[PDB]
Amino acid sequence: GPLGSARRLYVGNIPFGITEEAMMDFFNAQMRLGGLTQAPGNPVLAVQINQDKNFAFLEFRSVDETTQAMAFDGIIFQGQSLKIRRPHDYQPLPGAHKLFIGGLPNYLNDDQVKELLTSFGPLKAFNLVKDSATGLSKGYAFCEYVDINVTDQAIAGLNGMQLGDKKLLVQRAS
Amino acid sequence: GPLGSARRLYVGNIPFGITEEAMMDFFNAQMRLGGLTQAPGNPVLAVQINQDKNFAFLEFRSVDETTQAMAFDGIIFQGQSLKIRRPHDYQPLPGAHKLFIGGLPNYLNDDQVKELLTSFGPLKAFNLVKDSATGLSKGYAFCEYVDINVTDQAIAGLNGMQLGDKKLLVQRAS
């Protein structure tokens, strides 16, 4: 559900043969050295390793320390660059990363506007704002990417871009 | 398998007539005497002796204790100085020869993908990655050959291979 999986992280590319205790000790040490821990003690409570598919799940004692540990993505552990991700059934709340897109040509329809956006990744929400009586586009839209990490990429790739006689605006809607 | 040779050592210059039990007793006693054990009990599980060529292999219960026993090179047994070495197939960096196989037709199952790989020799590890929900192949797999010397020939033979619709990507997984 909406509040599920908030204290766990997926860790991929773990070093071959590593133990759960070693992984646990490494992350707890890094949390402390890196200044990511928010109270005395160990933020990582447990590590569950799948040796066959070479991945682990970390369980944290708190929601906010789980979030902080996302910053370890790519950290090198016994020669291996670790892949750190949210669990697949973790989701931010609806609208958390809604985008505003302004400066669109009024003659473009929904699908045409969406084509520009979906080049960065799939969308879980989209609406092109139209005049209700005439059905004509007002030249701005909102969207949300399935993968929320795509949000900053769309902004970086589209914001301030030339588009016809306009300069496109793409920013977080709140 | 990979770690299997991480728990063995070669012993040379063994005196004539020595038994496997006497050798096992000797090394367990040495490990305990040196304070080199990381748990109660016996670190050496088994000894295999070749009387004709005057050598033995030791098998240990743990990777760390095997590494500790490297310190016994030159140790005196029945008046003779023993030669202690890693097995020739010892892997200093574990997983160095794990392969990634990508671009597989998504209808192929475990045995079919293995049939492609085993033409170059027997595997010690294999897994085809599947969607846990549907049980359907994601179109990539990992493996490890029993003989790591075969690895580069497999890459040479399989990488870039046209497989019906598909082109295979075969490389060290890292």
Coordinates of C-alpha atoms in Angstrom, one line a residue:
Chain A
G1 CA 0.0 0.0 0.0
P2 CA 0.9 3.7 -0.1
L3 CA 2.9 3.6 3.2
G4 CA 4.6 0.2 2.5
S5 CA 8.4 -0.6 2.1
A6 CA 9.5 2.7 3.6
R7 CA 12.4 1.3 5.6
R8 CA 14.1 -1.0 3.1
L9 CA 16.5 -0.6 0.2
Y10 CA 17.5 -2.8 -2.7
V11 CA 21.3 -3.2 -3.0
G12 CA 22.6 -4.7 -6.3
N13 CA 26.0 -5.7 -7.5
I14 CA 27.1 -6.8 -4.1
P15 CA 30.6 -8.4 -3.8
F16 CA 30.6 -12.2 -4.5
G17 CA 30.6 -14.3 -1.3
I18 CA 29.9 -11.3 1.0
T19 CA 28.1 -12.1 4.3
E20 CA 25.0 -10.4 5.7
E21 CA 27.1 -9.3 8.8
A22 CA 29.8 -7.8 6.7
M23 CA 27.4 -5.9 4.5
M24 CA 25.5 -4.7 7.6
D25 CA 28.8 -3.5 9.3
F26 CA 29.9 -1.7 6.1
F27 CA 26.7 0.3 5.7
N28 CA 26.4 1.1 9.4
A29 CA 30.0 2.3 9.3
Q30 CA 29.4 4.4 6.2
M31 CA 26.2 5.9 7.7
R32 CA 28.3 7.1 10.6
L33 CA 31.4 8.2 8.6
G34 CA 29.3 10.0 6.1
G35 CA 27.2 11.8 8.7
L36 CA 23.9 10.3 7.5
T37 CA 22.9 8.8 10.9
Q38 CA 20.4 10.9 12.9
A39 CA 20.8 9.3 16.4
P40 CA 23.3 7.2 18.4
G41 CA 23.4 3.6 17.3
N42 CA 23.2 1.6 14.1
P43 CA 20.7 2.6 11.4
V44 CA 20.8 -0.7 9.6
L45 CA 19.0 -3.4 11.6
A46 CA 19.3 -6.3 9.2
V47 CA 20.5 -7.4 5.8
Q48 CA 18.9 -10.2 3.7
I49 CA 21.1 -11.5 0.9
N50 CA 20.0 -13.5 -2.2
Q51 CA 23.3 -15.1 -3.1
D52 CA 22.1 -16.7 -6.3
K53 CA 20.9 -13.4 -7.9
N54 CA 23.6 -11.3 -6.2
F55 CA 21.4 -8.7 -4.4
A56 CA 20.5 -7.7 -0.9
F57 CA 17.7 -5.9 1.0
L58 CA 18.7 -3.6 3.8
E59 CA 16.2 -2.9 6.6
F60 CA 16.6 0.4 8.5
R61 CA 15.4 1.4 11.9
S62 CA 13.8 4.6 10.6
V63 CA 12.2 6.1 7.5
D64 CA 14.4 9.2 7.2
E65 CA 17.7 7.2 7.5
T66 CA 16.5 4.9 4.7
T67 CA 16.0 8.0 2.6
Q68 CA 19.5 9.4 3.4
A69 CA 21.2 6.0 2.5
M70 CA 20.0 6.5 -1.1
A71 CA 23.0 8.9 -1.4
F72 CA 25.3 5.8 -1.2
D73 CA 24.3 4.8 -4.8
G74 CA 27.4 3.7 -6.6
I75 CA 29.6 3.5 -3.5
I76 CA 32.5 1.0 -4.0
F77 CA 32.5 -2.0 -1.7
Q78 CA 35.3 -4.6 -2.1
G79 CA 35.8 -3.4 -5.7
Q80 CA 32.1 -3.4 -6.6
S81 CA 30.1 -0.3 -7.3
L82 CA 26.9 -0.9 -5.4
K83 CA 23.5 -0.2 -7.0
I84 CA 21.2 1.3 -4.4
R85 CA 17.4 1.6 -5.1
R86 CA 14.0 1.9 -3.5
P87 CA 12.0 -1.3 -3.3
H88 CA 9.7 -1.7 -6.4
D89 CA 6.6 -1.6 -4.2
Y90 CA 7.7 1.7 -2.6
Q91 CA 6.0 4.7 -4.1
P92 CA 6.0 8.4 -3.2
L93 CA 2.6 9.9 -2.5
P94 CA 0.5 11.1 -5.5
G95 CA 1.5 14.4 -6.9
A96 CA 4.8 14.5 -5.0
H97 CA 6.8 15.2 -8.2
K98 CA 4.2 16.8 -10.5
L99 CA 5.6 18.9 -13.3
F100 CA 4.3 22.1 -14.9
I101 CA 5.1 22.4 -18.6
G102 CA 4.5 25.9 -20.1
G103 CA 5.0 27.5 -23.5
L104 CA 3.5 24.8 -25.7
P105 CA 2.1 25.6 -29.2
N106 CA -1.7 25.8 -28.9
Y107 CA -2.3 23.6 -31.9
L108 CA -0.6 20.5 -30.6
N109 CA -2.9 17.8 -29.1
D110 CA -2.5 15.5 -26.0
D111 CA -0.6 12.7 -27.8
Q112 CA 1.7 15.2 -29.6
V113 CA 2.6 16.9 -26.3
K114 CA 3.1 13.6 -24.5
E115 CA 5.5 12.4 -27.2
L116 CA 8.0 15.0 -26.0
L117 CA 7.7 14.0 -22.4
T118 CA 7.7 10.2 -22.7
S119 CA 11.1 10.3 -24.4
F120 CA 12.5 10.6 -20.9
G121 CA 10.4 7.7 -19.4
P122 CA 6.8 6.4 -18.9
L123 CA 4.3 8.7 -17.3
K124 CA 1.8 7.9 -14.6
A125 CA -0.1 11.1 -14.9
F126 CA -0.7 13.7 -17.7
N127 CA -3.2 16.4 -18.6
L128 CA -3.0 19.1 -21.2
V129 CA -5.2 22.0 -20.1
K130 CA -7.9 23.0 -22.6
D131 CA -10.7 25.5 -22.8
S132 CA -13.8 23.5 -21.8
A133 CA -16.2 25.2 -24.3
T134 CA -14.0 25.1 -27.4
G135 CA -11.8 22.1 -26.4
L136 CA -8.7 24.1 -27.5
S137 CA -5.3 23.8 -25.8
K138 CA -4.2 26.6 -23.4
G139 CA -0.6 25.8 -24.1
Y140 CA 0.3 24.3 -20.7
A141 CA 0.2 20.8 -19.2
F142 CA 1.0 18.8 -16.1
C143 CA 2.6 15.4 -15.8
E144 CA 4.2 12.9 -13.4
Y145 CA 6.8 10.2 -14.4
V146 CA 6.4 6.6 -13.2
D147 CA 10.0 6.7 -12.1
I148 CA 10.3 9.8 -10.0
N149 CA 14.1 10.0 -10.7
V150 CA 13.3 10.8 -14.3
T151 CA 11.8 14.1 -13.1
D152 CA 15.1 16.0 -12.8
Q153 CA 16.2 14.6 -16.2
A154 CA 13.1 16.0 -18.0
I155 CA 13.5 19.3 -16.3
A156 CA 17.2 19.5 -17.3
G157 CA 16.5 18.3 -20.8
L158 CA 13.4 20.4 -21.6
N159 CA 13.5 23.5 -19.5
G160 CA 14.4 26.7 -21.3
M161 CA 14.5 24.8 -24.6
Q162 CA 13.6 26.6 -27.8
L163 CA 10.3 25.4 -29.2
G164 CA 8.9 27.4 -32.2
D165 CA 8.8 31.0 -31.2
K166 CA 8.6 30.1 -27.5
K167 CA 11.0 29.1 -24.7
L168 CA 9.7 26.1 -22.9
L169 CA 9.2 26.2 -19.1
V170 CA 9.4 22.9 -17.2
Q171 CA 9.5 23.0 -13.5
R172 CA 8.1 21.2 -10.4
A173 CA 4.4 22.3 -10.1
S174 CA 4.8 23.0 -6.4
Chain B
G1 CA 32.7 -23.9 -6.6
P2 CA 34.3 -20.5 -6.9
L3 CA 34.8 -20.4 -3.2
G4 CA 35.3 -24.2 -3.2
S5 CA 39.0 -23.7 -4.1
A6 CA 39.0 -20.8 -1.6
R7 CA 38.8 -23.5 1.1
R8 CA 41.6 -25.8 -0.1
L9 CA 45.4 -25.8 0.0
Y10 CA 48.1 -27.8 -1.7
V11 CA 50.7 -29.5 0.5
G12 CA 54.0 -30.8 -1.0
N13 CA 57.0 -32.7 0.2
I14 CA 55.0 -35.0 2.4
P15 CA 57.1 -37.8 3.9
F16 CA 56.7 -41.4 2.8
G17 CA 53.9 -43.5 4.4
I18 CA 52.0 -40.6 6.0
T19 CA 48.2 -41.2 6.5
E20 CA 45.4 -38.8 5.8
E21 CA 44.3 -38.9 9.4
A22 CA 47.8 -38.2 10.7
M23 CA 48.1 -35.2 8.4
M24 CA 44.6 -33.9 9.4
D25 CA 45.5 -34.2 13.1
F26 CA 48.8 -32.4 12.5
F27 CA 47.2 -29.4 10.8
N28 CA 44.3 -29.1 13.2
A29 CA 46.9 -29.1 16.1
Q30 CA 49.0 -26.5 14.3
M31 CA 45.9 -24.3 13.8
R32 CA 44.9 -24.5 17.4
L33 CA 48.5 -24.0 18.6
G34 CA 48.9 -20.9 16.5
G35 CA 45.6 -19.4 17.7
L36 CA 44.6 -19.3 14.1
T37 CA 41.1 -20.8 14.5
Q38 CA 38.0 -18.5 14.4
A39 CA 35.7 -21.0 16.2
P40 CA 35.9 -24.0 18.5
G41 CA 36.5 -27.3 16.7
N42 CA 38.6 -28.5 13.8
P43 CA 39.4 -26.2 10.8
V44 CA 40.5 -29.1 8.6
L45 CA 37.6 -31.2 7.3
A46 CA 39.4 -33.6 5.1
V47 CA 42.8 -34.5 3.6
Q48 CA 43.4 -36.3 0.2
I49 CA 46.9 -37.7 -0.3
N50 CA 48.6 -38.8 -3.5
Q51 CA 51.3 -41.2 -2.2
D52 CA 52.9 -41.6 -5.7
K53 CA 53.5 -37.9 -6.2
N54 CA 54.0 -37.0 -2.6
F55 CA 51.4 -34.3 -2.2
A56 CA 48.1 -33.7 -0.5
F57 CA 45.1 -31.4 -0.6
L58 CA 43.6 -30.0 2.6
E59 CA 40.0 -29.0 2.8
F60 CA 39.0 -26.4 5.4
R61 CA 35.7 -25.4 6.9
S62 CA 36.2 -21.8 6.2
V63 CA 37.8 -19.3 3.8
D64 CA 39.5 -17.2 6.5
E65 CA 41.1 -20.2 8.2
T66 CA 42.4 -21.5 4.8
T67 CA 44.1 -18.1 4.3
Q68 CA 45.5 -18.3 7.9
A69 CA 47.0 -21.7 7.1
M70 CA 49.1 -20.2 4.3
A71 CA 51.4 -19.2 7.1
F72 CA 52.4 -22.8 7.5
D73 CA 54.6 -22.8 4.4
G74 CA 57.9 -24.5 5.5
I75 CA 56.3 -26.1 8.6
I76 CA 58.1 -29.2 9.9
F77 CA 56.3 -32.5 9.7
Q78 CA 58.1 -35.7 10.7
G79 CA 61.4 -33.9 10.2
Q80 CA 60.5 -32.6 6.7
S81 CA 59.6 -29.1 5.6
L82 CA 56.2 -28.9 4.0
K83 CA 55.4 -26.8 0.9
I84 CA 52.1 -25.0 1.2
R85 CA 50.4 -23.3 -1.8
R86 CA 47.1 -22.1 -3.1
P87 CA 45.3 -24.5 -5.5
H88 CA 46.1 -23.5 -9.1
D89 CA 42.4 -22.7 -9.7
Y90 CA 42.2 -20.4 -6.7
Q91 CA 40.5 -17.1 -7.4
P92 CA 42.1 -14.1 -5.6
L93 CA 39.2 -12.0 -6.8
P94 CA 36.0 -14.0 -6.5
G95 CA 33.5 -13.6 -9.3
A96 CA 36.1 -12.3 -11.7
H97 CA 34.9 -14.8 -14.3
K98 CA 31.2 -14.6 -13.8
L99 CA 29.6 -13.9 -17.2
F100 CA 26.6 -11.8 -18.1
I101 CA 24.5 -13.1 -21.1
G102 CA 22.1 -10.5 -22.5
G103 CA 19.9 -10.4 -25.6
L104 CA 18.4 -13.8 -25.1
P105 CA 15.1 -14.5 -26.9
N106 CA 12.5 -14.1 -24.0
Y107 CA 10.9 -17.5 -24.6
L108 CA 14.0 -19.6 -23.9
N109 CA 13.9 -21.4 -20.5
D110 CA 16.7 -22.4 -18.1
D111 CA 17.7 -25.6 -19.8
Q112 CA 17.7 -24.1 -23.3
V113 CA 20.0 -21.2 -22.3
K114 CA 22.3 -23.7 -20.5
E115 CA 22.4 -25.8 -23.7
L116 CA 23.8 -22.8 -25.5
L117 CA 26.4 -22.3 -22.8
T118 CA 27.5 -25.8 -22.1
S119 CA 28.8 -26.4 -25.6
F120 CA 32.0 -24.7 -24.3
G121 CA 32.1 -26.9 -21.2
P122 CA 30.3 -27.6 -17.9
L123 CA 28.9 -24.8 -15.7
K124 CA 29.3 -24.5 -12.0
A125 CA 26.8 -21.6 -11.7
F126 CA 23.9 -20.5 -13.8
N127 CA 20.7 -18.4 -13.4
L128 CA 18.2 -17.0 -15.8
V129 CA 16.6 -13.8 -14.5
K130 CA 12.8 -13.8 -14.4
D131 CA 10.0 -11.6 -13.4
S132 CA 8.9 -13.0 -10.0
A133 CA 5.3 -12.0 -10.8
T134 CA 4.9 -13.6 -14.2
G135 CA 7.8 -16.1 -14.1
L136 CA 8.8 -14.8 -17.5
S137 CA 12.5 -14.4 -18.5
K138 CA 13.8 -10.8 -18.6
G139 CA 16.1 -11.9 -21.4
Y140 CA 19.4 -12.1 -19.5
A141 CA 21.3 -14.6 -17.5
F142 CA 24.6 -15.1 -15.5
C143 CA 26.9 -18.1 -15.4
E144 CA 30.3 -19.4 -14.3
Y145 CA 32.2 -22.2 -16.0
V146 CA 33.8 -25.0 -13.9
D147 CA 37.0 -24.4 -15.7
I148 CA 37.6 -20.6 -15.7
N149 CA 40.1 -20.9 -18.6
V150 CA 37.1 -21.6 -20.8
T151 CA 35.5 -18.2 -20.0
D152 CA 37.2 -16.2 -22.7
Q153 CA 36.6 -18.8 -25.4
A154 CA 32.9 -18.7 -24.5
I155 CA 32.8 -15.0 -24.9
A156 CA 34.6 -15.3 -28.2
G157 CA 32.2 -17.9 -29.4
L158 CA 29.0 -16.4 -28.1
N159 CA 29.3 -12.6 -28.0
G160 CA 27.6 -11.0 -30.9
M161 CA 26.0 -14.4 -32.0
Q162 CA 22.7 -14.0 -33.9
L163 CA 20.0 -15.9 -32.2
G164 CA 17.0 -15.8 -34.5
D165 CA 15.5 -12.3 -33.8
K166 CA 18.3 -11.4 -31.4
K167 CA 21.9 -10.6 -31.0
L168 CA 23.7 -11.9 -27.9
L169 CA 25.8 -9.8 -25.5
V170 CA 28.3 -11.9 -23.6
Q171 CA 30.8 -10.3 -21.3
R172 CA 32.3 -10.5 -17.9
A173 CA 29.5 -9.4 -15.5
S174 CA 32.1 -7.6 -13.2

